[PDB]
Amino acid sequence: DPFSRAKSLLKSTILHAERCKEFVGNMLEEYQDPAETTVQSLVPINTWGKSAKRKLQEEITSDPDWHQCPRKRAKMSYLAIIAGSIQDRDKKQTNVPRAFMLRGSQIEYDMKATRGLVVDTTNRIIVGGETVLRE
């Protein structure tokens, strides 16, 4: 199930800094990761990979301690999921989208966490309708 599968991954990364840092580094540099094939099943085939990796690298440069902050983890999780997604080899690479629909579904996934799978109201962080953090 794409929904439940996305929910599991994002909980593991948003709630755990060490796992999020590991996950992000593996997606950015393409090394083994337990969510490798999961990531590929969730994102439609796209041309966004290099853009996502640039974004990831800008963030690490500007704030090394990004993994300390839950809002940043959610954002970097979004970019990392795209960074490890299946790329269309025949098309020009293009800019990452701000949101996309999880593969084979109308489940929206938003980078700024306004809508869909991951929702951040500045009080809670809600993953798949389940509140996982509350300030």
Numbering used by the authors: 547 to 681
What do the authors of the reporting publication say about this deposited model?
The three largest gene segments of the Thogotoviruses, THOV, DHOV and JOSV are homologous to those of IAV and code for the heterotrimeric polymerase. In this paper we present the atomic structures of the putative PB2 cap binding and 627 domains of THOV and the putative PA N-terminal endonuclease domains of THOV and DHOV. Despite very low sequence homologies, all domains have similar folds to those of the corresponding IAV polymerase domains. However, the critical active site residues in the putative cap binding and endonuclease domains are not conserved in THOV and DHOV and, contrary to the case of IAV polymerase, neither domain shows the expected in vitro biochemical activity.
To explore further the structural and functional similarity between THOV and influenza polymerase domains, we determined the structure of the so-called 627-domain of THOV by crystallising a construct comprising residues 543–701 of THOV PB2. The structure was solved de novo using anomalous scattering from a mercury derivative and refined to 2.4 Å resolution. Again, despite little significant sequence identity (∼8%) between THOV and IAV in this region of PB2 (although the motif QSLVP at the end of helix α3/4 is conserved), the domains clearly have the same fold. Interestingly the loop which in IAV carries the host-specific residue Lys/Glu627 is extended by two residues in THOV. A large region of the IAV 627-domain surface is positively charged, consistent with its ability to bind RNA. The corresponding electrostatic surface of THOV 627-domain also has positive patches but less uniformly. The structure-based multiple sequence alignment of this region of PB2 strongly suggests that DHOV, Jos and Quaranfil have a similar three dimensional structure to THOV, although Quaranfil is more diverged.
